[PDB]
């Protein structure tokens, strides 16, 4: 998160931290969010050969008794996700086990408006800056699909366009999989943007995927 502020500790009890392990040399992290005791929602590009979800965290280096750390037993990336258009950048992860719903671990209930949104993550706070230990949140303005014109592969039906170009505030590298919340409702998922950090950034439109989602949760 660029140009945000530290969340109050444990205000986002649905925020997952993910440690992805790649078949090559492992090591990257994404955000996510708990939507069912044993289901976490995140961006498709965060797939790896193994993933460990840390729920309940705020400073992710400091261990504390709100934490619950779980392995992922099944990776459910969208069948139509395409690595060179980044369409359908959405993945559900099945946890080994049902997380305990506590104050600090809970699910996410499955004139500008209305289109005032927040996003949080532990990702980079500048273009080549380190990530954040403490979970960071930023307030972003949702936008017209014309603002994301330069992103050759944007589709207004599949994706949202987030952030004021005139401002520095944005989700960034390592924020992927994070949920965008507009007036209380989860509307988007951090996907990508320009590597120079200049807003707007593209997020996956959750609304387009509620049918495929509830499909995964009906089996499984
Ligand atoms: C999330 C974000 C916001 C604004 C600009 C940019 S530029 C790259 C990213 C996120 N991202 C990254 S950054 C490092 C990997 C972890 C992450 O995905 O954030 N690698 C990607 C591969 C495919 C699609 C997206 C990827 C990103």
Residue numbers in the entry: 16 to 36, 36A, 36B, 36C, 37 to 61, 63 to 123, 130 to 148, 150 to 169, ...
Publication excerpt:
Chymase is a mast-cell-specific serine protease that is stored within secretory granules and released together with heparin and histamine in response to allergen challenge or other stimuli. Recent studies have shown that chymases possess processing activity for biological peptides and cytokines implicated in a variety of diseases. For example, the chymases of primates and dogs have highly specific angiotensin II (Ang II) generating activity, and the results of animal studies suggest that chymase contributes to the pathogenesis of cardiovascular diseases via Ang II generation. Based on the results of these studies, inhibition of chymase is expected to provide therapeutic means for the treatment of these diseases.
The crystal structure of human chymase with TJK002 was determined at 2.8 Å resolution. X-ray crystallographic study showed that TJK002 forms a non-covalent interaction with the catalytic domain of human chymase. The 4-methylbenzothiophen-3-yl fragment of TJK002 occupies the S1 pocket. The benzene ring of the benzimidazole scaffold shallowly occupies the S2 domain and could not form an effective hydrophobic interaction to the S2 site. The alkyl chain of S-butyric acid is bent and the carboxylic acid motif of TJK002 forms hydrogen bonds to the residues which are members of a catalytic triad (His57, Ser195). In our case the druglike carboxylic acid motif of TJK002 supplies two O atoms in the binding to the protein, which represent a new serine protease inhibitor motif. The carboxylic acid fragment of TJK002 forms hydrogen bonds with the imidazole N(∊) atom of His57 and/or the O(γ) atom of Ser195 which is a member of a catalytic triad. This imidazole ring of His57 forms π–π-stacking with the benzene ring of the benzimidazole scaffold as P2 moiety. Fragment molecular orbital (FMO) calculation of the atomic coordinates by X-ray crystallography showed that this imidazole ring of His57 could be protonated with the carboxyl group of Asp121 or the oxyanion group of Ser195 and the stacking interaction between the benzimidazole group and His57 is stabilized. So far the importance of the S2 site has not been noted, but this π–π interaction between the benzene ring of the benzimidazole scaffold inhibitor at the S2 site makes sense because the stacking interaction is also found in the complexes crystallized under different pH conditions.
